[PDB]
Coordinates of C-alpha atoms (C1' of nucleotides) in Angstrom, one line a residue:
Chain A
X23 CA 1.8 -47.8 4.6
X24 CA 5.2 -47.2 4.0
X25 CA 7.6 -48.3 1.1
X26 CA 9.9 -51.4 1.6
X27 CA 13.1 -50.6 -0.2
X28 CA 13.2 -46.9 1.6
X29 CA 12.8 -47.8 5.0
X30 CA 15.0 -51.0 4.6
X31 CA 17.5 -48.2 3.4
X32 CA 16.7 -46.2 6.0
X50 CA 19.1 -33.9 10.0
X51 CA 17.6 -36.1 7.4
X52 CA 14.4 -34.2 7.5
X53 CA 16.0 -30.2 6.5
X54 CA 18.4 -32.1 4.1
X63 CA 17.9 -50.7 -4.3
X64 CA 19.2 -47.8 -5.3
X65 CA 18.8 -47.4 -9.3
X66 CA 19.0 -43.8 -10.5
X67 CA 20.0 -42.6 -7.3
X68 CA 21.3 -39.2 -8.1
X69 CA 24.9 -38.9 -6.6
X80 CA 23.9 -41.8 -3.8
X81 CA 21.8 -40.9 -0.9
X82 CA 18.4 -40.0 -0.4
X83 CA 16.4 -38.0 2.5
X84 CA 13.3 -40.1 2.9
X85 CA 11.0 -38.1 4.6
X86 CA 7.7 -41.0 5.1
X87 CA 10.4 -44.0 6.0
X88 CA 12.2 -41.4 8.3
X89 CA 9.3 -40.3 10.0
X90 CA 7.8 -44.2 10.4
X126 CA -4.4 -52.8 -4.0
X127 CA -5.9 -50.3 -7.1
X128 CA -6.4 -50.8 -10.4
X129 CA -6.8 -48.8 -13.8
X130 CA -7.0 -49.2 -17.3
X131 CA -4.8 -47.2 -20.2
X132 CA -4.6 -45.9 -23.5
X133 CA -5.1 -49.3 -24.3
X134 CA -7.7 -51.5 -22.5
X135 CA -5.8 -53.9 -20.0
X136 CA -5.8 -54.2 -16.3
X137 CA -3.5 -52.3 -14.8
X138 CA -3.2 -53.2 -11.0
X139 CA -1.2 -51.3 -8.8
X140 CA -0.5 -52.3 -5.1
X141 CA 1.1 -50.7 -2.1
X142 CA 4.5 -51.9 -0.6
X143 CA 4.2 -51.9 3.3
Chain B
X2 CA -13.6 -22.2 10.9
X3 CA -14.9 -23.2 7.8
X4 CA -17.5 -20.6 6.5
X5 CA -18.1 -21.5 3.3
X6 CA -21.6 -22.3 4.2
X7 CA -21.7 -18.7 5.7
X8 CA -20.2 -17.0 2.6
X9 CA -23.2 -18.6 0.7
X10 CA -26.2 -17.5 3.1
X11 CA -24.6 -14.1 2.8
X12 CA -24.5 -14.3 -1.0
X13 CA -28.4 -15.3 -1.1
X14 CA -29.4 -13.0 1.5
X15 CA -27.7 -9.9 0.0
X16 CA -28.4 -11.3 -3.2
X17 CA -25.1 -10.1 -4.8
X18 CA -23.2 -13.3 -5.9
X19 CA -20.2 -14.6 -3.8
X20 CA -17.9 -12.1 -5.1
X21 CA -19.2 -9.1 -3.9
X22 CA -19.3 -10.3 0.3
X23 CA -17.2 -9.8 2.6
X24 CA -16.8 -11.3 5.6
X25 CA -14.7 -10.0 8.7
X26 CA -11.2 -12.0 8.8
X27 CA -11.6 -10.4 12.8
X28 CA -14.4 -12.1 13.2
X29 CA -14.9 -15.8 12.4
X30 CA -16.0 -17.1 15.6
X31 CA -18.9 -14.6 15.5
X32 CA -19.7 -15.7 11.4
X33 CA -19.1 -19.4 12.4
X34 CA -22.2 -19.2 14.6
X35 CA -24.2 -18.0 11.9
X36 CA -25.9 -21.3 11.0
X37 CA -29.6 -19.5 9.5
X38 CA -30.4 -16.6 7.8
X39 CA -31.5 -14.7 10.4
X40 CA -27.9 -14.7 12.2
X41 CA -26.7 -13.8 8.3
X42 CA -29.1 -10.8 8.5
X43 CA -27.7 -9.6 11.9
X44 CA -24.5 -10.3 10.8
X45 CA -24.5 -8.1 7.8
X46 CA -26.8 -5.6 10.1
X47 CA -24.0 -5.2 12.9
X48 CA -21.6 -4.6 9.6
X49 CA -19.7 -7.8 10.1
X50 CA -20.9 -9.1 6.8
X51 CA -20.4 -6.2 3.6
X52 CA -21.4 -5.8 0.5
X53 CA -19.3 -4.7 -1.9
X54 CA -20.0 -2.2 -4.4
X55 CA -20.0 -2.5 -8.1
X56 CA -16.5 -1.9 -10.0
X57 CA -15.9 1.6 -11.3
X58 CA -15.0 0.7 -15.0
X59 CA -16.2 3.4 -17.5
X60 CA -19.1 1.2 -20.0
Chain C
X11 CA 16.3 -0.4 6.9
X12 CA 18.0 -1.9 3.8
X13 CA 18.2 -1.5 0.3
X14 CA 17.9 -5.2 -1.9
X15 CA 18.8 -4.8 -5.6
X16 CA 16.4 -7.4 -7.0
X17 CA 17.9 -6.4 -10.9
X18 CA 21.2 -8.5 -9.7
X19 CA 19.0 -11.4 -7.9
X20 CA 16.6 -11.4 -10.6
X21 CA 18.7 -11.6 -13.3
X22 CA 18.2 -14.3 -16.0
X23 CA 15.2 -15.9 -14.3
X24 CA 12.1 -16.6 -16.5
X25 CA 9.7 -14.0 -17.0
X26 CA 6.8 -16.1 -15.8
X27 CA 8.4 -16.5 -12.1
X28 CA 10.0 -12.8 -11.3
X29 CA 7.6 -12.2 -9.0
X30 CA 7.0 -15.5 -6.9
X31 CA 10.8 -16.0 -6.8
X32 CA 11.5 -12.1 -5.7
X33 CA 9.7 -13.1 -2.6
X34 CA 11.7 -16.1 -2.0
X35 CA 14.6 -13.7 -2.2
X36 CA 13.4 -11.5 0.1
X37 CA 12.8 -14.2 2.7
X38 CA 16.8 -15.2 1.5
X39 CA 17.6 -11.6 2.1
X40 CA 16.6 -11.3 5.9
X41 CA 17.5 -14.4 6.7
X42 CA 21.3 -13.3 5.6
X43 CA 21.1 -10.1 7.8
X44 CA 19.4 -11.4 10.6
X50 CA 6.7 -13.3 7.5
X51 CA 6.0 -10.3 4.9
X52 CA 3.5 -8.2 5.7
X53 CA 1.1 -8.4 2.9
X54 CA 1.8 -5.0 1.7
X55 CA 5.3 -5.8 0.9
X56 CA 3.7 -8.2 -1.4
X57 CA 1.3 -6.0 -3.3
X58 CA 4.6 -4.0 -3.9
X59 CA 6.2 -7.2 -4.9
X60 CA 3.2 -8.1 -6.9
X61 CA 2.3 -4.3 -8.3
X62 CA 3.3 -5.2 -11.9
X63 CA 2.5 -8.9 -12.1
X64 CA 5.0 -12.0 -12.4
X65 CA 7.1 -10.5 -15.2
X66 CA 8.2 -7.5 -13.7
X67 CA 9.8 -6.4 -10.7
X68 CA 11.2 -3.3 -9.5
X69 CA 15.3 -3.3 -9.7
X70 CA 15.8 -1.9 -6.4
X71 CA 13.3 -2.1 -3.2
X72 CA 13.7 -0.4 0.0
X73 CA 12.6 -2.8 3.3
X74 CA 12.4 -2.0 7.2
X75 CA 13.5 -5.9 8.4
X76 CA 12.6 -5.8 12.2
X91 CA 11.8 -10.7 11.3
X92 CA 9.0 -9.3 10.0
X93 CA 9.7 -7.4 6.5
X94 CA 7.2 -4.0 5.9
X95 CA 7.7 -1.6 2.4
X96 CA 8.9 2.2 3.4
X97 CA 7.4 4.8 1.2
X98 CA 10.0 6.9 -0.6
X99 CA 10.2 9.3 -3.3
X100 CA 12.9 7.3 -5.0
X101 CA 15.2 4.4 -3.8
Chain D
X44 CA 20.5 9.3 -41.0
X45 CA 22.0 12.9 -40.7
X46 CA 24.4 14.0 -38.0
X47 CA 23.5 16.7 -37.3
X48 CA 20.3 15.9 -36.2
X49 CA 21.4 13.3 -33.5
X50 CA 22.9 14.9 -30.9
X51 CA 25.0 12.8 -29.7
X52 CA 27.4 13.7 -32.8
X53 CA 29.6 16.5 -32.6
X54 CA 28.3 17.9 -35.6
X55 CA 24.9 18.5 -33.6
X56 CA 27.1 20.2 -31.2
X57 CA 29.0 22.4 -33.0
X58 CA 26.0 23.8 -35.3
X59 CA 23.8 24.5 -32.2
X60 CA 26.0 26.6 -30.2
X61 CA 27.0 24.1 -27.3
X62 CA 30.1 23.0 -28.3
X63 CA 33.0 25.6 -28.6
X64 CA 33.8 26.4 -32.3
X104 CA 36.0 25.5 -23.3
X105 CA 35.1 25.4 -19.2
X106 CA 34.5 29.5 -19.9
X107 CA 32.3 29.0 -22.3
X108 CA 30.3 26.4 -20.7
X109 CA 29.9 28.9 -17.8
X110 CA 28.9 31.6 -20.3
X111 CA 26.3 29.1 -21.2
X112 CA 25.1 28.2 -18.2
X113 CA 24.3 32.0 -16.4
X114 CA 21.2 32.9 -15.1
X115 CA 20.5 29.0 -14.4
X116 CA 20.4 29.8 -10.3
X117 CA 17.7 32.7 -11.2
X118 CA 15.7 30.3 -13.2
X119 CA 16.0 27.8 -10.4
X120 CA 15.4 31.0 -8.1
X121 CA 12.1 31.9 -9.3
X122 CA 10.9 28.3 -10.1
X123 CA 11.3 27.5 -6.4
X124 CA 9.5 31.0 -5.1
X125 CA 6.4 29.9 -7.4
X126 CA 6.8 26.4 -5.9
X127 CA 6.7 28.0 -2.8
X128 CA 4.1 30.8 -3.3
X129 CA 1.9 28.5 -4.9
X130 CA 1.2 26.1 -1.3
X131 CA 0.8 27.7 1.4
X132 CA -1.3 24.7 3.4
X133 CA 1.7 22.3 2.2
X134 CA 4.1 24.7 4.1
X135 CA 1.7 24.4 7.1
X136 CA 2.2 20.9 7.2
X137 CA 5.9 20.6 7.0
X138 CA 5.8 23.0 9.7
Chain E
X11 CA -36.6 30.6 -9.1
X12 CA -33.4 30.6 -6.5
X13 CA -32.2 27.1 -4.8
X14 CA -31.0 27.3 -1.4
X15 CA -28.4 24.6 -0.4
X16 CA -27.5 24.5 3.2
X17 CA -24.2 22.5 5.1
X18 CA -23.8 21.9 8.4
X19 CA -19.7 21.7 9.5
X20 CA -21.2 22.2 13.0
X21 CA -19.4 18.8 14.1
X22 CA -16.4 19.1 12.6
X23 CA -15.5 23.0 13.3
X24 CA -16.4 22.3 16.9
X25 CA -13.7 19.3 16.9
X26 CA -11.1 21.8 15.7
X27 CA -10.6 20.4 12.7
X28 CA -12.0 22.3 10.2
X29 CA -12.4 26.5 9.1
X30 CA -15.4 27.1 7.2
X31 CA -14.4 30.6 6.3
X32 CA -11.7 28.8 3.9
X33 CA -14.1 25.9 2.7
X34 CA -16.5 29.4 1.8
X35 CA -13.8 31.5 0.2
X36 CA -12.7 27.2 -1.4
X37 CA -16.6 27.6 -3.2
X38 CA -16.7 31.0 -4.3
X39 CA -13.6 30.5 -5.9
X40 CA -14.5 27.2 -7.7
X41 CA -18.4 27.3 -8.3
X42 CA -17.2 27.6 -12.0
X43 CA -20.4 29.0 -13.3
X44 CA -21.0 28.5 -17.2
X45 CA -17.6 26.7 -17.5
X46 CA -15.8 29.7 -15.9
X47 CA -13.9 29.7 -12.3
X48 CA -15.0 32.9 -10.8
X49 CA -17.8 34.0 -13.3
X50 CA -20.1 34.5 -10.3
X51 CA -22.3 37.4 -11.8
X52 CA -24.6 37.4 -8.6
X53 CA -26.1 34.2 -9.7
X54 CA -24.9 32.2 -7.5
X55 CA -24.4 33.6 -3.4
X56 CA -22.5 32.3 -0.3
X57 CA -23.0 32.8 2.7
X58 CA -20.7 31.7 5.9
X59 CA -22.4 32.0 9.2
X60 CA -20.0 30.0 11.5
X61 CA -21.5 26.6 11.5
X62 CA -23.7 27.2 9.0
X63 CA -22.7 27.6 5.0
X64 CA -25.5 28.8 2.9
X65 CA -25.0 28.5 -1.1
X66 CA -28.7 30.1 -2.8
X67 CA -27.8 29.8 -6.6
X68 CA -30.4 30.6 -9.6
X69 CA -28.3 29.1 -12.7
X70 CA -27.9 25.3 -13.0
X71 CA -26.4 24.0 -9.8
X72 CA -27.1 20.8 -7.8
X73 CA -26.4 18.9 -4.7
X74 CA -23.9 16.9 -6.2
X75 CA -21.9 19.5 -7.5
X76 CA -21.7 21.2 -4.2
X77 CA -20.8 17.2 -2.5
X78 CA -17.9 17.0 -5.5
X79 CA -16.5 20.0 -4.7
X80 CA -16.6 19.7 -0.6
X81 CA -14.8 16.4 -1.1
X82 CA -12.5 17.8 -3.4
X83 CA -12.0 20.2 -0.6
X84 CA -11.0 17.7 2.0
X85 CA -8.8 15.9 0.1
X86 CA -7.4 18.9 -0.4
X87 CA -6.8 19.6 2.4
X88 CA -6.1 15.8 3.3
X89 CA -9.0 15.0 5.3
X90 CA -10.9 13.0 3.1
X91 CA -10.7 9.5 5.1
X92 CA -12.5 11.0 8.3
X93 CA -15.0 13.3 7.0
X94 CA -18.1 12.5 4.6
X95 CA -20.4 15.0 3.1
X96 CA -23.7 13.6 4.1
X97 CA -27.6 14.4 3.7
X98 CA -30.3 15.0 5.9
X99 CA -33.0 16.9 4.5
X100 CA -33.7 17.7 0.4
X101 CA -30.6 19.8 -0.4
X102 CA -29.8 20.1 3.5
X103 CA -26.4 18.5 4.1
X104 CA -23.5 18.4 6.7
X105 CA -20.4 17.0 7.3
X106 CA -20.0 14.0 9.1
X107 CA -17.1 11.6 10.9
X108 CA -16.6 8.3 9.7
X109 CA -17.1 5.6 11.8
X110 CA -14.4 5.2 15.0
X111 CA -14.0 2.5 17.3
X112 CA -13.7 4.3 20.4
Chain F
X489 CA 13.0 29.5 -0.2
X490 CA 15.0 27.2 -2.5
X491 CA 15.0 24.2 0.7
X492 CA 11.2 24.9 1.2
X493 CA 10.8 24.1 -2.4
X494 CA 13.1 20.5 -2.4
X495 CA 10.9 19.9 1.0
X496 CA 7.8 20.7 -1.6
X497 CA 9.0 18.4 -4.3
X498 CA 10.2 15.2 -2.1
X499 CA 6.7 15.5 -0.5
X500 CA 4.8 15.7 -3.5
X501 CA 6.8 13.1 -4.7
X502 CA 6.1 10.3 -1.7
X503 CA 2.0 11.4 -2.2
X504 CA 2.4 10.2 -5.6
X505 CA 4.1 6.7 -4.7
X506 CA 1.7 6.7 -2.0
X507 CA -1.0 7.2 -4.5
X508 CA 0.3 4.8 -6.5
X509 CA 0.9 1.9 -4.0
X510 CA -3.1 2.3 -3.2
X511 CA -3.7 2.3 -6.5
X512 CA -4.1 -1.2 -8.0
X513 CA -4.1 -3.4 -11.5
X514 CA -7.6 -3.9 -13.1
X515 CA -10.4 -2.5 -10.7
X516 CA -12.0 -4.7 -8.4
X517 CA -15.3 -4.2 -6.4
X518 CA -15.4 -1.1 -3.8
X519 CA -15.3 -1.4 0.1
X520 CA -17.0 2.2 1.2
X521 CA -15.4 3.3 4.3
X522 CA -18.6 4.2 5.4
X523 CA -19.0 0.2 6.0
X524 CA -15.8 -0.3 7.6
X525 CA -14.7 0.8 10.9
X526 CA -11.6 2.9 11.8
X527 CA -9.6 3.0 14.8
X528 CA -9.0 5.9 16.9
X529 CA -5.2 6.0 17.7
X530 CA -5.0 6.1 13.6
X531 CA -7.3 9.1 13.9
X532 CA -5.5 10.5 16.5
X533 CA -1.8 10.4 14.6
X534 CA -3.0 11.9 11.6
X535 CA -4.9 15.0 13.1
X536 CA -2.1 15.3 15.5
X537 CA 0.7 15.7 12.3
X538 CA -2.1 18.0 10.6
X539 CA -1.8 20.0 13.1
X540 CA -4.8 19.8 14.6
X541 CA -6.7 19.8 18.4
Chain G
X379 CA 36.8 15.8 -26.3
X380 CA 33.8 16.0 -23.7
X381 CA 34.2 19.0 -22.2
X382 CA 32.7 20.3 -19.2
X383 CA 29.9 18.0 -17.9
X384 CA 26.4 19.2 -16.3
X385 CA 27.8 17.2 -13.5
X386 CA 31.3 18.9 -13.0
X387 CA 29.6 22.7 -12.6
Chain H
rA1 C1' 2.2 -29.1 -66.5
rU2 C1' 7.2 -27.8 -68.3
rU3 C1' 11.2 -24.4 -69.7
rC4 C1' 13.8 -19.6 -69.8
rC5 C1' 14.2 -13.6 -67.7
rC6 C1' 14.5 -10.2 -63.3
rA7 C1' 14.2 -9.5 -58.1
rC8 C1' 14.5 -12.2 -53.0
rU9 C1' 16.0 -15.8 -49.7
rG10 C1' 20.4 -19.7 -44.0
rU11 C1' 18.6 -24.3 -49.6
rC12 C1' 23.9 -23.9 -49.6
rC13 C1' 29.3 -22.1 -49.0
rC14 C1' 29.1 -22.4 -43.1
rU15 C1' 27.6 -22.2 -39.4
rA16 C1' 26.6 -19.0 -35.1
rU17 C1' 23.2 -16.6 -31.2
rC18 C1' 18.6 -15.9 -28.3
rU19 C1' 13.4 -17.3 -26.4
rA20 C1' 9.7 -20.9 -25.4
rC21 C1' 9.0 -26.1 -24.7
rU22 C1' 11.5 -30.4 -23.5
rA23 C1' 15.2 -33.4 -20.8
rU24 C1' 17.6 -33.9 -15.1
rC25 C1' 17.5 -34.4 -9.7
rU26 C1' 14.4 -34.1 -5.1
rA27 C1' 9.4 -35.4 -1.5
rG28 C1' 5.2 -38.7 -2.3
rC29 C1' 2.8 -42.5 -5.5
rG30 C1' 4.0 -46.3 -8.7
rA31 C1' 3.6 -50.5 -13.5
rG32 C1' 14.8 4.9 -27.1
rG33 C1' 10.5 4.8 -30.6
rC34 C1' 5.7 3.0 -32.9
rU35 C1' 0.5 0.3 -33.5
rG36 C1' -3.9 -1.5 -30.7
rU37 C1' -6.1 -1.6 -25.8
rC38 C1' -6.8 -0.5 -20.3
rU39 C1' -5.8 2.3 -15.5
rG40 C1' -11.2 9.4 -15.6
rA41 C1' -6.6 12.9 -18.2
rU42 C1' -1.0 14.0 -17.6
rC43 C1' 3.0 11.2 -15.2
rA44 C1' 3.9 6.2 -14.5
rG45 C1' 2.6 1.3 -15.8
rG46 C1' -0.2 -3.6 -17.3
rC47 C1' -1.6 -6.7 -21.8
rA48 C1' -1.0 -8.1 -27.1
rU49 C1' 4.1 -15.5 -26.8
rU50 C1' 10.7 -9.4 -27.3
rG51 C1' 3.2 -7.1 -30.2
rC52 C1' 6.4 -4.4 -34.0
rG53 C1' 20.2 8.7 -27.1
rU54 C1' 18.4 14.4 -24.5
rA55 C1' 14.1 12.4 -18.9
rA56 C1' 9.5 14.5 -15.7
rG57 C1' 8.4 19.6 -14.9
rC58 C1' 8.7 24.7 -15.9
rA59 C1' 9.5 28.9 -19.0
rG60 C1' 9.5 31.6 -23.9
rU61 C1' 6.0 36.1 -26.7
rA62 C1' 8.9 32.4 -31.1
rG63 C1' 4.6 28.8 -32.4
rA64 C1' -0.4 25.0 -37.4
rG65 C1' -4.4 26.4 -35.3
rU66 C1' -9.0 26.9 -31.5
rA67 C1' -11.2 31.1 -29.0
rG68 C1' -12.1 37.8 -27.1
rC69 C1' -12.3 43.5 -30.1
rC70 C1' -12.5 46.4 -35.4
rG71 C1' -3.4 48.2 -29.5
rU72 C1' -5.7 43.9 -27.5
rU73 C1' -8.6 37.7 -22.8
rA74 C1' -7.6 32.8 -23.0
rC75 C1' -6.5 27.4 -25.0
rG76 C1' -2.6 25.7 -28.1
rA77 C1' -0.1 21.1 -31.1
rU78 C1' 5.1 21.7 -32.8
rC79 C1' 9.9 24.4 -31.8
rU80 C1' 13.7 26.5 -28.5
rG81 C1' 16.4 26.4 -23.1
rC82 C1' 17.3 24.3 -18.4
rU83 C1' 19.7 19.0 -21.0
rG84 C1' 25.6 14.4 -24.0
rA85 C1' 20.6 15.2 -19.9
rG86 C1' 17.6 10.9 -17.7
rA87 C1' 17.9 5.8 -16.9

RNA sequence: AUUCCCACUGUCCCUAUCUACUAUCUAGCGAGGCUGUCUGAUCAGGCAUUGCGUAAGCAGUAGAGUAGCCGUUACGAUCUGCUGAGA
């Protein structure tokens, strides 16, 4: 359980790219390596994990 | 090391609300044993579990 | 034994964080010379978050202890 | 606000005896300080005997 | 009519920490009879035996009078953290060490 | 005299921080000594600066 | 303007 | 409800400064003084969304008054000196 996009990316640890400040990153779960809700409005909000 | 089930016996026992025990940081092998009242009596016996005293604030 | 001037560290922080981020300084401080004992942090804590004294006196051995002294 | 009230103002200083109307008179002034502090510290003193005890 | 009010600084004059000829002269100096320090018009006697201090008073005067002034006493005199004015009889009290892990 | 005296003020001076650094913000409940236990070599130190056998 | 100061005594 | 008189005002001439909040990135997830109050009282401090220039201590025989006798215990605001000091 691990996101795609940062471990595809992936000293690090004591320090798709959009809104990257300036652009590299230090992350720490990729380095080391289904839920759903309503809203304000009813819906069905499903979010899911990226392994 | 989890004696939150210990800090509640000694609250009932005493009968002085959570606030006022205190339990020895030294000792929390010897309080993790205490699994019945009785062990919480001896405990607060042998002084290892206190009671504190009521704030001196002026009415 | 040193002397930190926490009114220059301290200066133009928020009120509502003096006294968390005064001990982050002191950790800072004897990490630049070289655990606080918990009575350095009733010191650090003796007039709440919004104030802190402008000058504290430490013994840094690194753990950090308060010295008493008349004034610093 | 009047002047000579604040002390900070010359006028204060002038109409209250501290200020020369220089180094002389600032010494006549200041005599008999060293007795004051004299007799202050024998009371200090006299008046502990056990705190004496300790420091020795 | 008179109260007798006995202390017992048996154990802490025979650990050489303590005079009980000053803590004596400490109460006849502060009984403060009627609001007064020193207005001790033979109401109120001490006596200071060696291990022994005897205070027989006939004007108002309790137990806890005589315990706030023997801790005011020690603190005085700094001691306050090892030494507890304690009871064993009705108005019979002595002075006592704190607990000490030996 | 006069150094006796400045040894007199700085003393009385540190008892008051002292005093002070015990002392706390809004009271809280009481621990008596006479439930907690005090070591000896604390003991020891302070009788031996009192001056004491 | 001063003068003599507590300090320089 | 409308119109004139006086006073006030960042409405404006004409904007400027500060505080709080917000916005941004990162790890993970993811569509000196004063009022009130409290530390038993002084001293020193906390709180009340800045709440709204002579230190602590000691002394004087000067000191409103509280408390002993028909020259005299004691307490004592305020004032004066150490002190353009203290911070």
């Amino acid at each position: 359980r691990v996101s795609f996009k940062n471990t595809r990316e992936t000293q690090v640890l004591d320090h798709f790219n959009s809104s990257i400040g300036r652009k590299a990153r230090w992350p720490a779960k990729s380095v080391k390596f289904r839920r759903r809700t309503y809203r304000a409005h009813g819906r069905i909000n499903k979010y899911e994990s990226s392994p | 090391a989890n004696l939150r089930t210990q800090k509640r016996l000694a609250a009932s026992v005493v009968g002085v609300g959570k606030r006022k025990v205190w339990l020895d940081p030294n000792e929390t092998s010897e309080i993790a044993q205490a699994n019945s009242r009785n062990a919480i009596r001896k405990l607060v016996k042998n002084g290892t579990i206190v009671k504190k005293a009521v704030t001196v604030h002026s009415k | 034994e040193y002397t930190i001037n926490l009114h220059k560290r301290l200066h133009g922080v928020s009120f509502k964080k003096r006294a968390p981020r005064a001990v982050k300084e002191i950790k800072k401080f004897a990490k630049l010379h070289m655990r606080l004992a918990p009575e350095l942090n009733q010191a650090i804590w003796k007039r709440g978050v919004k104030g802190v004294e402008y000058r504290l006196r430490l013994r840094i051995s690194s753990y950090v202890e308060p010295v008493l002294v008349a004034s610093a | 606000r009047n002047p000579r009230k604040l002390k900070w103002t010359k006028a204060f200083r002038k109409a209250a005896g501290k200020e020369l109307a220089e180094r002389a008179f600032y010494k006549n002034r200041m005599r008999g300080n060293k007795e004051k502090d004299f007799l202050r510290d024998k009371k200090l003193v006299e008046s502990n005997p056990e705190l004496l005890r300790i420091r020795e | 009519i008179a109260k007798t009010f006995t202390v017992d600084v048996s154990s802490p004059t025979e650990n050489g920490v303590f005079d009980p000829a000053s803590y004596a002269k400490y109460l006849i100096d502060h009984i403060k009879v009627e609001g007064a320090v020193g207005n001790l018009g033979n109401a109120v006697t001490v006596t200071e035996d060696g291990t022994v201090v005897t205070v027989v008073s006939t004007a108002k005067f309790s137990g806890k009078y005589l315990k706030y002034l023997t801790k005011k006493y020690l603190k005085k005199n700094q001691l306050r953290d090892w030494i507890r004015f304690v009871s064993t009889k009705t108005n019979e009290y002595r002075l006592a060490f704190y607990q000490v892990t030996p | 005299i006069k150094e006796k005296a400045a040894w007199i003020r700085n003393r009385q001076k540190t008892m008051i921080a002292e005093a002070r650094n015990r002392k706390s913000l809004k009271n809280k409940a009481i621990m008596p000594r006479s439930k907690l236990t005090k070591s000896f070599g604390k003991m020891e130190e302070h009788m031996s600066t009192l001056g004491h056998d | 303007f001063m003068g003599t100061l507590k300090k320089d005594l």
